[PDB]
Design a protein around this ligand. Structure first.
Ligand code: G0G
Ligand code: CL
Ligand code: CL
Ligand code: CL
Lengths: 99, 99
């Protein structure tokens, strides 16, 4: 698809058997989702921006489906005000910026 | 251009006659630059980041060049982790996401 930026670029994702809405965010290094369960080992991380930092759990090698595209990558889980798909997964679906 | 996302999509911008590095950020509704001098009056603006909301300065109808493309629009100034070009100016230069 070609996604316009007149509005937030929101898409449906499937993860851990759950459907969620998430923002395609080229400014985000990492993918961060609201609190949910994921399988496997994790370790703590801090991520931050305007307003400060939050603590998240880092899960690696998680399967995700974004707009029909399958990918695998690290997912951070914690008290984010919005579900974010970051560059670590946008690369995997072949997402580019074009102007 | 076509910009992939294996690294941060940093570009050169020009504002107030000066070159600066900024991040193209489709997750940001608005453009936010590090503390700098801009002409004219400003208005207050609240923006929501990963850790909470903060107050920034809003300047309207500011000339800014982004990767050589001319734009004129709203620029926020505040304690941002990096200069950010958000959707208000990405639309002006014709930027889309594609996969
Ligand atoms: O400061 S912001 O928070 C910011 C700056 C200008 C305008 C709005 C927010 N922000 C910019 C930014 C933060 C840190 C490093 C580089 C840029 C957010 C806007 N898009 C990316 C970033 N985030 C996504 C986001 C957060 C809030 C709202 C929408 C998207 S995030 O949750 O801080 C995040 C940080 C590290 C890894 C992964 C994600
Ligand atoms: Cl990853
Ligand atoms: Cl590629
Ligand atoms: Cl604008």
């Amino acid at each position: 698809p070609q996604i316009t930026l007149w509005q937030r670029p929101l898409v449906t994702i499937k993860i851990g058997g759950q459907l969620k809405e998430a923002l395609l965010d080229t400014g985000a290094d990492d993918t961060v989702l609201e609190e949910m369960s994921l399988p496997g080992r994790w370790k703590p991380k801090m991520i931050g921006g305007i307003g400060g930092f939050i603590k998240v759990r880092q899960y690696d090698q998680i399967l995700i489906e974004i707009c029909g595209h399958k990918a695998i990558g690290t997912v951070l889980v914690g008290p984010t005000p919005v579900n974010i798909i970051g560059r670590n997964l946008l690369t995997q679906i072949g997402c580019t910026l074009n102007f």
